[PDB]
């Protein structure tokens, strides 16, 4: 029908004032000092914020061009915000100021694409120029510091994250649960995780992040792929004859041979998930073998000439809980026999050795290896349950950013390689005089993040950018000390891969929204 | 779609005007003076609420901003209410107090982090100087006052609480019922109860409290866990040929195995309630047997041979009533035989000094104890109905309460704890200047709701208050003495437990309605 | 009309956003950065106004709230601009700044009562401070700095005081006149001052000043006070035949004897001044004498016999023009008579060395003097007449400044002063902590104007301020340099009276805003 246009300036707004309106949130809530944001949800009671991040998924805009313009921005942000773990805000920060500047230059009529090449070649220097500034992680005590960075000064987290990984290992996967209780426990798990995907993602669970988890969940292992729903289906009486969710394993599923079937001529009234079996050939057999013995279940075959069917319950093994994701498949804890799987896990080892071969040796290993699984799990206490998840949730993010980070090396923090990075970019010049203002826009952009923080401290940015730009080397300003000191000597390091992702991201959400000059909408 | 945004002291008023306005109702009623108060139900006549917890609960909020500020208080003062069995307007009083400080201190824009940190950092020290200060409780006579005070000058409650609490024994339970008519009745009862969770919340009855209860329940015992619906079928048969509400006793429902069958195939139409079997091995076979015995009615186990499709009706016991919550699961009285009971009991009893084993003992005896029971029931009589549903609450919070404070041991009332701990709280400082605010305002929150007794005597709480302050020891204000003496030689004491659950709670809420600035909503 | 009656914020707010915009357009002026102001009118082209103060007066504030508001700061600030002759923005700005933290304060609930005092108390010590710094005014070339920073940038207004000043004297007083042309004239003006009031304000001529002009005056001289009409009536004939404007010099003119009649009675088409006849007694008589002959009209006594109405308008000599304030009257130029005149000057300078007796010799002294010192006019051109006033108006400004400004001595400019004794200043502590924050709220005024004049740099007046209150001794920042400097070797001084004046005004203005605590106005 009829449309209402705003042109170029009047589409930029709306997505400005809203990207404004979230980021600013965002970049008060960056940084320690942003004790929390709150708003209402239009189900359940209203969620609550403590994070910079949760700020932005909190809020929401009235307005469908300012609300779209910030979902750009978030979505973009959370995108950021897994990989590196950190720096969500960041980016949103950064992002945020590359579009003012964008759309003031839209406002200049500077055609947006040179704007956007200068754009992504000043990230593109930067990144580099980052690469070689960043340095190599620093120990737990930095990476406690480093999780205290994804904790926005939550202490806890960070404590938590270094604790966890310093039991599990760095190398060691560290996974979070929800607390058992306020208090934080962290045990070691038993069990093994196997990356196998979802087979479709109608199998995906509720939650958002669209990993499926079932409570105690029943494992039906087959060898054999599953073809047919007729076959399954006798499993299924048992299981029907059942209800908290059941997990089945296949070995191959003809999303031809097993859907059409199964979806429609099964009511799928108990909670099904279907996961490939891990591996192939002998070895996915074996891990067949070393899932079942875990989970306690028996797996039946072809060759065994067992029956699905003839298969009960009881062969079906019962999990604690399970997760999947697309990536990866991972069962929390099989109830399995303590004696059982440590007799399997030995029997496996006994092999590895015994194989001659490396990759015989490898496979074992690897077999092994899961059995025991190496897992730690952490639960987050909460004062209350909303606490928890928000807790949970940042605990996560801080855990994967402490990981990348330490991997990666851990830049300087506060900006400081933003800031410096960009001093080495000023003098690259873009290719034409837009390029290079948007080139231009870029450093401005990485600076003011810097200045946010200065803001927060209260102490005016200027001066501290300034400072430190002028500083060679690594200079940064600590917050906390209100001090001038190396960045590397204070020990706080924002990690390279969180900084780089955020700002390419946010480079790129700049990009989108500068390009796009006049939206239309219905009327 | 648009949402209308308040922001910060914005977001705050509305709830902190909810908040008065359902504290105001709640501090006037706290205390004896509260009279009553009314407010309309959508549905059937509109509730009365004598209490201040019930006030709490009647009155909402049109707005929904202050409707759901409101109710934030209230769901945390309902969870303080039922640990501390007493002390629900305390909590309320308190969160007012601290929530309205923390707003001031919004405005004053002092990040609330540090506000919330002081707080909980003063509630903490707050805490730990009461629970020196707690003493144990007194005698029955204090009793009766402990139960007055959960009464609010329901004299009849905290005679009612002493008498059954003298007649079961402080150790032993009470169990409350509605009375059979307006003379109150204390009869001890006939009876066990196992605790043994409701496999699912959909069991759970439609009363808010969630336990359920059935009339005239009949009970079938299983040793073998309920694997499956069919089996349960012919018992249903006999069932679905039955009506008032069937209990069901399985050793264990993979819920997984049962569930899927029994809800989709199971019409359901006849209420049912699953419990596990209570213990385990023999022993849970044993409860079982004196479960059976007590109800009268048969079990079957595999080993027996006896089929469920076989055992009839008859064989299922009866119960007068059942009474299930998650932590337990209780039959309040089943038909039994007098007879068969007292010879299950001795045979138990002959069991125990039998078994040589002090477990072998220990199991006995914790089941003839059981089926003993020394259960005692207390009916309330009500002028109306209504009244004996509000005196039945009041009652059960008072015991709650009472039972709590006996064990704790009773601190002085008044808030005498509070503003005595106060003291000795606001010498301890925060970290920063803005946590030493908030502690403060926490100290500021114990402090007001002595002033509302006092204001509700009339008299100037700020004299009061600064007596208070200056006793050193144990000093307060006896509201009926109008006279100052020692809490204790008052013997007019208010239960550790529920003073600290309700501190505790209220801090909670208190921060994290601070922590709010702003809220959003759709518009 | 009818009245509304308000208490609270609500006053202060319309108040306070009254300043701020009169504020807002002044503090941007303020400094040789303001460009401009613009107003409109009803009939012709609209105005277009210059200097802050002009940019003030042209303000006006719809609202009644806000215009009052702003009213009362500009009456202030022009009370201060007229004895200062400068600083009337300072005083606007410091004005504002008191003003919006008092209000903030006011939000606080201090009582105001007390910051009130600490600002004084503040302002109190600042003046010592000030009075202390101050340093003694530098020469003509500073004058001409001295001017322009009246002149805000106006080269051409510094350089006529310098000019002017040179010529007259320091001492000398320089009178402004509007240009005969738009190239500007210095005319220095033989003629003698006498303080003399005007007897009625009726008497006041129309303009705004309130001191009366005659062109081309006729000046009557009598020995005896002027007492009756009727005396006066046989001049006042040959006065009709006059026209030109006459005045009148008597001893003593009773208001109501003459005024009475004259001004009812005559129409005074022709316009009519009366002075007393300066000095008393002999002196009086002799300065009668220097008039006469400076006038050139000769003057009646009783003594000589000779009568008024014998008297002729010869006899009344002629001024060029004269102006009469309430404080003194001066005659521009009388046309004298050359001989006469000089002869005179010469006998009482003969007299005054001849007289053995100080007192002879200053009466005579101070006589030959008045009639030496002579009077110097400046005339200022415009493009247009507009101009030419706005113009007028600035000069006679920087003149009143600059005069104040080198009796006075210098201090440095930049609002260093200001900054400088803050720091001092803070280290004082009010009596309570309302008048601490108060003290501090006077401080942060002080300092802010440096900001604003920083601010028009661009440059970060957060960093120069630091700055600058680092630097001990005169540390101060120089707009045009956007170097550090020392204020006195920059040469850049504001006037300590203007400095001083403006700031008490506005810390008085200030404090009065912040009572009030009711309103009443028209409904
Ligand atoms: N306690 C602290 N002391 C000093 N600097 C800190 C501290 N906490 C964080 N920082 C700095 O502030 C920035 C990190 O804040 P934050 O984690 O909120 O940003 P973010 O990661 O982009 O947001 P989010 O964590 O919500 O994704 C980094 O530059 C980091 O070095
Ligand atoms: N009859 C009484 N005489 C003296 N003081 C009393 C009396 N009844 C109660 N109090 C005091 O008043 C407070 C208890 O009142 P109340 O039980 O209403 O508060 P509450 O427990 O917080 O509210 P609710 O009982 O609704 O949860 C205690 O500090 C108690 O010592
Ligand atoms: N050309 C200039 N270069 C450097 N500083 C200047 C210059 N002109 C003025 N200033 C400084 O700016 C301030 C004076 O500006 P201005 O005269 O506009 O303020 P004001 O006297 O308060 O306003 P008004 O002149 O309207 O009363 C002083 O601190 C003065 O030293
Ligand atoms: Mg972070
Ligand atoms: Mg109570
Ligand atoms: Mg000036």
């Known amino acids: 029908a009829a449309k209402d246009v705003k042109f170029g300036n009047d589409a930029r707004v709306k997505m400005l004032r809203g990207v404004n309106v979230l980021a600013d949130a965002v970049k008060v809530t960056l940084g320690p000092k942003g004790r ?50 950190d720096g969500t805000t960041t980016a949103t920060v950064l992002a945020q100021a590359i579009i003012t500047e964008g759309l003031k230059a839209v406002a200049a009529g500077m055609n947006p694409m040179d704007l956007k090449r200068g754009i992504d070649k000043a990230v593109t220097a930067a990144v580099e120029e980052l690469k070689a500034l960043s340095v190599p992680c620093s120990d737990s005590k930095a990476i406690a510091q480093v999780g205290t960075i994804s904790a926005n000064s939550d202490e806890t987290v960070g404590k938590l994250i270094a604790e966890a990984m310093d039991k599990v290992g760095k190398e060691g996967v560290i996974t979070v649960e929800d607390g058992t209780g306020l208090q934080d426990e962290l045990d070691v798990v038993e069990g093994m995780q196997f990356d196998r995907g979802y087979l479709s993602p109608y199998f995906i669970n509720k939650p958002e992040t669209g990993a499926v988890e079932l409570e105690s969940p029943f494992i039906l292992l087959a060898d054999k792929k599953i073809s047919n729903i007729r076959e399954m289906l006798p499993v299924l009486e048992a299981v029907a004859k059942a209800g908290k969710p059941l997990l089945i394993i296949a070995e191959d599923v003809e999303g031809e041979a097993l859907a059409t079937l199964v979806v429609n001529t099964m009511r799928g009234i108990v909670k099904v998930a279907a996961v490939k079996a891990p591996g192939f050939g002998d070895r996915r057999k074996a891990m067949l073998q070393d899932i079942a013995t875990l989970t306690g279940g028996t797996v039946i075959s072809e060759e065994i000439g067992m029956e699905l069917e003839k298969a009960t319950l009881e062969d079906l093994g019962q999990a604690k809980r399970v997760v999947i994701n697309k990536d990866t498949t991972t069962i929390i804890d099989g109830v399995g026999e303590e004696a059982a799987i440590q007799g399997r896990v030995a029997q496996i080892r006994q092999q590895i050795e015994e194989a001659t071969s490396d990759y015989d040796r490898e496979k074992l290993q690897e077999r092994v290896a899961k059995l025991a699984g190496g897992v730690a799990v952490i639960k987050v206490g909460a004062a209350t349950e909303v606490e928890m998840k928000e807790k949970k949730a940042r605990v996560e993010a801080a855990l994967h950013a402490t990981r990348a980070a330490v991997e990666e090396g851990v830049v300087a923090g506060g900006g400081v390689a933003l800031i410096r990075v960009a001093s080495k970019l000023a003098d690259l010049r873009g290719q034409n005089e837009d390029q290079n203002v948007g080139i231009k826009v870029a450093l401005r952009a990485m600076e003011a993040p810097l200045r946010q923080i200065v803001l927060n401290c209260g102490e005016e940015p200027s001066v501290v950018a300034n400072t430190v730009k002028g500083g060679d080397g690594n200079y940064g300003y600590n917050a906390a000390t209100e001090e001038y000191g190396n960045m590397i000597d204070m020990g706080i390091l924002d990690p390279t891969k969180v900084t780089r992702s955020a700002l390419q991201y946010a480079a790129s959400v700049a990009g989108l929204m500068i390009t796009t000059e006049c939206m239309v909408t219905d009327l």
Chains 1, 2, 3 share one sequence.
């Open 36 to 85: 929390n944001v709150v708003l209402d949800k239009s189900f359940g009671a209203p969620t609550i914020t403590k994070d910079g991040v949760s700020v932005a998924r909190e809020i929401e805009l009235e307005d469908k061009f300012e609300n779209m313009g910030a979902q750009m921005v978030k979505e973009v942000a959370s995108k950021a915000n897994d990989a590196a773990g």
